[PDB]
Amino acid sequence: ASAARRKEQELERSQEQALREKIDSVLLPILGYGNYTAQVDIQMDFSAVEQTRKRFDPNTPATRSEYALEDYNVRKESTRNFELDTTISHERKQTGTVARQTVSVAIKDMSESEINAIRQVLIGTVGFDQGRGDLLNVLSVKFA
Amino acid sequence: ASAARRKEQELERSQEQALREKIDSVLLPILGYGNYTAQVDIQMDFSAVEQTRKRFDPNTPATRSEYALEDYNVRKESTRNFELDTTISHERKQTGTVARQTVSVAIKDMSESEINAIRQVLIGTVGFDQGRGDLLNVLSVKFA
Amino acid sequence: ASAARRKEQELERSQEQALREKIDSVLLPILGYGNYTAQVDIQMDFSAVEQTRKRFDPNTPATRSEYALEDYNVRKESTRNFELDTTISHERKQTGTVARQTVSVAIKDMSESEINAIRQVLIGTVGFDQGRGDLLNVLSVKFA
Amino acid sequence: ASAARRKEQELERSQEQALREKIDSVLLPILGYGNYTAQVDIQMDFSAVEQTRKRFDPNTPATRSEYALEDYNVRKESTRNFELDTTISHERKQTGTVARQTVSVAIKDMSESEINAIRQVLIGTVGFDQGRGDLLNVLSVKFA
Amino acid sequence: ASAARRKEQELERSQEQALREKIDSVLLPILGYGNYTAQVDIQMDFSAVEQTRKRFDPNTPATRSEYALEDYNVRKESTRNFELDTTISHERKQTGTVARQTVSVAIKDMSESEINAIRQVLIGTVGFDQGRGDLLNVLSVKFA
Amino acid sequence: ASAARRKEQELERSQEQALREKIDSVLLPILGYGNYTAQVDIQMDFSAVEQTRKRFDPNTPATRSEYALEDYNVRKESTRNFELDTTISHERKQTGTVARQTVSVAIKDMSESEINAIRQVLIGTVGFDQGRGDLLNVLSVKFA
């Protein structure tokens, strides 16, 4: 029960560790050893979702049987059968999708252009996405 | 029964410990050894939620059988059958989701800008989220 | 029967002990050894709640079969069948949720600002929440 | 039968003992050894309560089948079926809840402010609650 | 359960490693050792989708049986049967499709034409596709 | 499950390797050793598609039985049966079809005619096809 849950926790940590390497592999040759520091956080969910969809197309009907009666003298009778396009889809979702991610970078003292360029580099280095509400902050402060 | 519950408690502590490392890895090189102190708290729940949804689309009907009678002289009769889009979803929730989290940081004596910058760094260092009603306080006081 | 109940009691004590460490880890470097004292209390419940909800959506009906008769000369007849969205939820609550918590801190002799700042630090150190009717008091008295 | 009941008695005593330590851990460094005395009492109950609730929502009805007849010439007929939201809850109460608690403190000879402050400290030290009709008295008398 | 999931994670890393070789095999002979740095990220999904389609062609009907009655004096009666073209398709999707990919390249200090040419080379070196919302950034910054 | 999927990945790499030989076998004797560099990418899918078609020919009917009645005095009655051409097709698709492919070639420094001729040679050397949205870029840049 709770034995497996702890394992899940460890997995999250692993993800963070991976990120903590990648940012280390890019900022080190450009900024320098001891002139920067950063940390990351990854939050995920472990739900279990299944979906079954069964759709129809009402705009394309096909007739199979038809009966009509038009007895004037005004008796009018009609009986028709139809066949429709059916689509069935069954989907199972993954377990462990990343929900949110936060990255913070502090640089020892910079102009606006340099910070913007470093942020642009980190955009591809990390993979920031605005759809998931991700967070990425880069700034320069005085060390001590 | 109660033997497993205690384990859950330990898990919470582990989470706090993790945070107590991350804040230590960022504030130490910028502020300095012995010039800061902080503690965290994490509160979670261990419920068990299952959901089953079965939705329909009323705006897209598809006809299958149709019978009509229009006997004037004004007898009018109609009988129709319909087919609708059906969606079935089954979801199971996780056990151990984080509900609230509190972070407090005290700095030995600072200007407003420095405190704001440190708070901004901690925002990404911890992962503060306003949706869950999280709490983060950073301030400077005189030590003794 | 009563053998397990005693165990529950011990668990509560453990919680208090944890708090008695955290307040010790924050107030000690700022106030000093022998200049403060504090105690905490945690009260919980051990009920067992299960819930089953079965909800409907009346504003979105979907028709399945329809029969109508409009014989003028004013005979009017109608018979319709409907399909509705059904949601089923099954929830099981935890055992051992914290209900109330009280914290009291006495400081050896202070200005209002210092007490307010210490209270603000303790807010994040402990995790005071007004929703549960929690209690936190910090004051300064003359020792002997 | 009566063998277990005695055990329950012992449990109550344990509770009192715990309180007799906590008040000892707070009043001793501020008041001094031999300048105070206190005793506590805890009264509980050992009932066994089970509850089963089955609630409905009358303000949100959902129609399933409907038949109508409107034969003028004024024959009016209607027959409708409804579906309602159902909630089922099953609860089991704890055994050993604290009902009332009394605390009495006597201090060797004090001003009103000092007594008020000591009472405020004891409020958080013990956890006095007015909902349960708890009792807490602190006063100063001449010893002999 | 969770044992296989971790394997999936490793697979993603492998993909990135492959890319980290290819960019190394192209930029090295043109730019030079120690004058560039780059990192990549690949995000995928592990769903399980099955589809079943059953289509009809209403514009091409074929008659099988036909009955007609044209009794003048105006009794008109008709009854026809039809045969239609039926197409049945069953599809199963893959597991592990690439969703998004980010590439970032920094070059030590360049004119616009050189950067454009390097980007064009990397377009074929990596396989950037705008349909999936892929990201590729190449820029020049001052190293330190 | 995931053990076979990895194998699929390896297969893709093999394809690329093959291409990396063919371009090496053509450009080397014409351009020269160390005056060019190139890389390729191949993306495929591993779906599983089955199709069943059942077609009719409505323009060529064949009569089998016929009954007619032409009682004047104007009773007219007809009843005919038909036989139609039926075609049944069952198809199973391959697994591992190439979807897209990208080729990039950089030549050390050229006139437009030479680049056009090299592109024309590579067209047959690789097999560029515009139907699949393939990509082939050849350009000349200054090396370093």
Side-chain angles (χ1 to χ4, degrees):
Chain A
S2 285
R5 161 84 185 77
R6 184 201 100 231
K7 314 295 217 34
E8 303 163 3
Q9 261 204 124
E10 300 304 322
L11 175 147
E12 324 175 42
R13 300 202 214 286
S14 276
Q15 282 262 333
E16 290 159 343
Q17 193 47 31
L19 216 51
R20 248 187 314 251
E21 311 295 29
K22 286 201 313 234
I23 304 162
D24 263 348
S25 89
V26 160
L27 281 193
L28 201 144
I30 170 178
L31 269 184
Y33 191 128
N35 301 56
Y36 79 108
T37 181
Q39 273 274 350
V40 316
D41 283 312
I42 278 142
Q43 183 214 320
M44 21 184 73
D45 62 40
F46 291 82
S47 310
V49 188
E50 298 199 36
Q51 283 226 32
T52 306
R53 187 95 173 282
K54 180 176 166 357
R55 182 171 41 266
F56 277 83
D57 193 349
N59 277 322
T60 295
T63 322
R64 185 128 256 178
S65 314
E66 158 195 308
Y67 173 86
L69 194 138
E70 286 197 323
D71 173 33
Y72 293 61
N73 221 282
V74 195
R75 273 295 282 246
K76 279 173 133 293
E77 201 162 352
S78 148
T79 311
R80 336 170 58 100
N81 288 25
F82 293 96
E83 296 233 287
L84 303 145
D85 310 359
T86 89
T87 319
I88 310 198
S89 307
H90 169 50
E91 323 167 24
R92 164 191 312 286
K93 293 316 181 37
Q94 212 198 335
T95 51
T97 325
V98 175
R100 249 187 65 116
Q101 152 187 269
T102 42
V103 175
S104 71
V105 179
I107 308 144
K108 190 183 326 191
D109 44 6
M110 281 220 162
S111 164
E112 180 58 275
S113 278
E114 287 88 294
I115 298 274
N116 164 17
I118 297 203
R119 164 148 169 115
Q120 229 69 36
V121 170
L122 263 293
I123 281 295
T125 309
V126 157
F128 165 72
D129 179 29
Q130 255 307 5
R132 285 178 333 191
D134 273 299
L135 202 56
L136 160 74
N137 314 127
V138 172
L139 54 93
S140 97
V141 279
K142 156 179 269 193
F143 276 29
Chain B
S2 285
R5 161 84 185 77
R6 184 201 100 231
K7 314 295 217 34
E8 303 163 3
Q9 261 204 124
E10 300 304 322
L11 175 147
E12 324 175 42
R13 300 202 214 286
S14 276
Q15 282 262 334
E16 290 159 343
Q17 193 47 31
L19 216 51
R20 248 187 314 251
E21 311 294 30
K22 286 201 313 234
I23 305 162
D24 263 348
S25 89
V26 160
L27 281 193
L28 201 144
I30 170 178
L31 269 184
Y33 191 128
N35 301 56
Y36 79 108
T37 181
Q39 273 274 350
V40 316
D41 283 312
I42 278 142
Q43 183 214 320
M44 21 184 73
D45 63 40
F46 291 82
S47 310
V49 188
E50 298 199 37
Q51 283 226 32
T52 306
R53 187 95 173 282
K54 180 176 166 356
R55 182 171 41 266
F56 277 83
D57 193 349
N59 277 322
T60 295
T63 322
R64 185 128 257 178
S65 314
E66 158 195 308
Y67 173 85
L69 194 138
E70 286 197 323
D71 173 32
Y72 293 61
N73 221 282
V74 195
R75 273 295 282 246
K76 280 173 133 294
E77 201 162 352
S78 148
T79 311
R80 336 170 58 100
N81 288 25
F82 293 96
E83 296 233 287
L84 303 145
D85 310 359
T86 89
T87 319
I88 310 198
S89 307
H90 169 50
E91 323 167 24
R92 164 191 312 286
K93 293 316 181 37
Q94 212 198 335
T95 51
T97 325
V98 175
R100 249 187 64 116
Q101 152 187 269
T102 42
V103 175
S104 71
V105 179
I107 308 144
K108 190 183 326 191
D109 44 6
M110 281 220 162
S111 164
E112 180 58 275
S113 278
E114 287 88 294
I115 298 274
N116 164 17
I118 297 203
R119 164 148 169 115
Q120 229 69 36
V121 170
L122 263 293
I123 281 295
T125 309
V126 157
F128 165 72
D129 179 30
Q130 255 307 5
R132 285 178 334 191
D134 273 299
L135 202 56
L136 160 73
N137 314 127
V138 171
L139 54 93
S140 97
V141 279
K142 156 179 269 193
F143 276 29
Chain C
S2 285
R5 161 84 185 77
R6 184 201 100 231
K7 314 295 217 33
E8 303 163 3
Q9 261 204 124
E10 301 304 322
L11 175 147
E12 324 175 42
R13 300 202 214 286
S14 276
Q15 282 262 334
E16 290 159 343
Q17 193 47 31
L19 216 51
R20 248 187 314 251
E21 311 295 29
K22 286 201 313 234
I23 304 162
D24 263 348
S25 89
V26 160
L27 281 193
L28 201 144
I30 170 178
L31 269 184
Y33 191 128
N35 301 56
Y36 79 108
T37 181
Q39 273 274 350
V40 316
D41 283 312
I42 278 142
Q43 183 214 320
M44 21 184 73
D45 62 40
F46 291 82
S47 310
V49 188
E50 298 199 36
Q51 283 226 32
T52 306
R53 187 95 173 282
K54 180 176 166 356
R55 182 171 41 266
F56 277 83
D57 193 348
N59 277 322
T60 295
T63 322
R64 185 128 257 178
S65 313
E66 158 195 308
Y67 173 86
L69 194 138
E70 286 197 323
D71 173 33
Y72 293 61
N73 221 282
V74 195
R75 273 295 282 246
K76 280 173 133 293
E77 201 162 352
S78 148
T79 311
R80 336 170 58 100
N81 288 25
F82 293 96
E83 296 233 287
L84 303 145
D85 310 359
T86 89
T87 319
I88 310 198
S89 307
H90 169 50
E91 323 167 24
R92 164 191 312 286
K93 293 316 181 37
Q94 212 198 335
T95 51
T97 325
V98 175
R100 249 187 65 116
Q101 152 187 269
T102 42
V103 175
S104 71
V105 179
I107 308 144
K108 190 183 326 191
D109 44 6
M110 281 220 162
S111 164
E112 180 58 275
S113 278
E114 287 88 294
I115 298 274
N116 164 17
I118 297 203
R119 164 148 169 115
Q120 229 69 36
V121 170
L122 263 293
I123 281 295
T125 309
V126 157
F128 165 72
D129 179 30
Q130 255 307 5
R132 285 178 333 191
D134 273 299
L135 202 57
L136 160 73
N137 314 127
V138 172
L139 54 93
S140 97
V141 279
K142 156 179 269 193
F143 276 29
Chain D
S2 285
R5 161 84 185 77
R6 184 201 100 231
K7 314 295 217 34
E8 303 163 3
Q9 261 204 124
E10 300 304 322
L11 175 147
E12 324 175 42
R13 300 202 214 286
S14 276
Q15 282 262 334
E16 290 159 343
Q17 193 47 31
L19 216 51
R20 248 187 314 251
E21 311 294 30
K22 286 201 313 234
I23 304 162
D24 263 348
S25 89
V26 160
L27 281 193
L28 201 144
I30 170 178
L31 269 184
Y33 191 128
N35 301 56
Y36 79 108
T37 181
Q39 273 274 350
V40 316
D41 283 312
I42 278 142
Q43 183 214 320
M44 21 184 73
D45 63 40
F46 291 82
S47 310
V49 188
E50 298 199 36
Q51 283 226 32
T52 306
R53 187 95 173 282
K54 180 176 166 356
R55 182 171 41 266
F56 277 83
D57 193 348
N59 277 322
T60 295
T63 322
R64 185 128 256 178
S65 314
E66 158 195 308
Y67 173 86
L69 194 138
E70 286 197 323
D71 173 33
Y72 293 61
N73 221 282
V74 195
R75 273 295 282 246
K76 279 173 133 293
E77 201 162 352
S78 148
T79 311
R80 336 170 58 100
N81 288 25
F82 293 96
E83 296 233 287
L84 303 144
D85 310 359
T86 89
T87 319
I88 310 198
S89 307
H90 169 50
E91 323 167 24
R92 164 191 312 286
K93 293 316 181 37
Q94 212 198 335
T95 51
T97 325
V98 175
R100 249 187 64 116
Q101 152 187 269
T102 42
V103 175
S104 71
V105 179
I107 308 144
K108 190 183 326 191
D109 44 6
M110 281 220 162
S111 164
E112 180 58 275
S113 278
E114 287 88 294
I115 298 274
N116 164 17
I118 297 203
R119 164 148 169 115
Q120 229 70 36
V121 170
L122 263 293
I123 281 295
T125 309
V126 157
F128 165 72
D129 179 30
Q130 255 307 5
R132 285 178 334 191
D134 273 299
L135 201 56
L136 160 73
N137 314 127
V138 172
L139 54 93
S140 97
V141 279
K142 156 179 269 193
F143 276 29
Chain E
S2 285
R5 161 84 185 77
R6 184 201 100 231
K7 314 295 217 34
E8 303 163 3
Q9 261 204 124
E10 300 304 322
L11 175 147
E12 324 175 42
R13 300 202 214 286
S14 276
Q15 282 262 334
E16 290 159 343
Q17 193 47 31
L19 216 51
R20 248 187 314 251
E21 311 294 29
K22 286 201 313 234
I23 305 162
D24 263 348
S25 89
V26 160
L27 281 193
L28 201 144
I30 170 178
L31 269 184
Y33 191 128
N35 301 56
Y36 79 108
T37 181
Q39 273 274 350
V40 316
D41 283 312
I42 278 142
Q43 183 214 320
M44 21 184 73
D45 62 40
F46 291 82
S47 310
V49 188
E50 298 199 36
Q51 283 226 32
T52 306
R53 187 95 173 282
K54 180 176 166 356
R55 182 171 41 266
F56 277 83
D57 193 349
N59 277 322
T60 295
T63 322
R64 185 128 257 178
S65 314
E66 158 195 308
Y67 173 85
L69 194 138
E70 286 197 323
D71 173 33
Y72 293 61
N73 221 282
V74 195
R75 273 295 282 246
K76 279 173 133 293
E77 201 162 352
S78 148
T79 311
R80 336 170 58 100
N81 288 25
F82 293 96
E83 296 233 287
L84 303 144
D85 310 359
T86 89
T87 319
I88 310 198
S89 307
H90 169 50
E91 323 167 24
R92 164 191 312 286
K93 293 316 181 37
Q94 211 198 335
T95 51
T97 325
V98 175
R100 249 187 64 116
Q101 152 187 269
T102 42
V103 175
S104 71
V105 179
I107 308 144
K108 190 183 326 191
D109 44 6
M110 281 220 162
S111 164
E112 180 58 275
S113 278
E114 287 88 294
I115 298 274
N116 164 17
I118 297 203
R119 164 148 169 115
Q120 229 69 36
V121 170
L122 263 293
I123 281 295
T125 309
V126 157
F128 165 72
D129 179 30
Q130 255 307 5
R132 285 178 333 191
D134 273 299
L135 201 56
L136 160 73
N137 314 127
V138 172
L139 54 93
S140 97
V141 279
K142 156 179 269 193
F143 276 29
Chain F
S2 285
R5 161 84 185 77
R6 184 201 100 231
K7 314 295 217 34
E8 303 163 3
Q9 261 204 124
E10 300 304 322
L11 175 147
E12 324 175 42
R13 300 202 214 286
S14 276
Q15 282 262 334
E16 290 159 343
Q17 193 47 31
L19 216 51
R20 248 187 314 251
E21 311 294 29
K22 286 201 313 234
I23 304 162
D24 263 348
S25 89
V26 160
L27 281 193
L28 201 144
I30 170 178
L31 269 184
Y33 191 128
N35 301 56
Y36 79 108
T37 181
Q39 273 274 350
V40 316
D41 283 312
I42 278 142
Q43 183 214 320
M44 21 184 73
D45 63 40
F46 291 82
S47 310
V49 188
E50 298 199 36
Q51 283 226 32
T52 306
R53 187 95 173 282
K54 180 176 166 356
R55 182 171 41 266
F56 277 83
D57 193 349
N59 277 322
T60 295
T63 322
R64 185 128 256 178
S65 313
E66 158 195 308
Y67 173 85
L69 194 138
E70 286 197 323
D71 173 33
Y72 293 61
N73 221 282
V74 195
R75 273 295 282 246
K76 280 173 133 293
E77 201 162 352
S78 148
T79 311
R80 336 170 58 100
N81 288 25
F82 293 96
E83 296 233 287
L84 303 144
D85 310 359
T86 89
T87 319
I88 310 198
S89 307
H90 169 50
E91 323 167 24
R92 164 191 312 286
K93 293 316 181 37
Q94 211 198 335
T95 51
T97 325
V98 175
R100 249 187 64 116
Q101 152 187 269
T102 42
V103 175
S104 71
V105 179
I107 308 144
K108 190 183 326 191
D109 44 6
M110 281 220 162
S111 164
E112 180 58 275
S113 278
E114 287 88 294
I115 298 274
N116 164 17
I118 297 203
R119 164 148 169 115
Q120 229 70 36
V121 170
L122 263 293
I123 281 295
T125 309
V126 157
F128 165 72
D129 179 30
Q130 255 307 5
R132 285 178 333 191
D134 273 299
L135 202 56
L136 160 73
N137 314 127
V138 171
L139 54 93
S140 97
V141 279
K142 156 179 269 193
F143 276 29

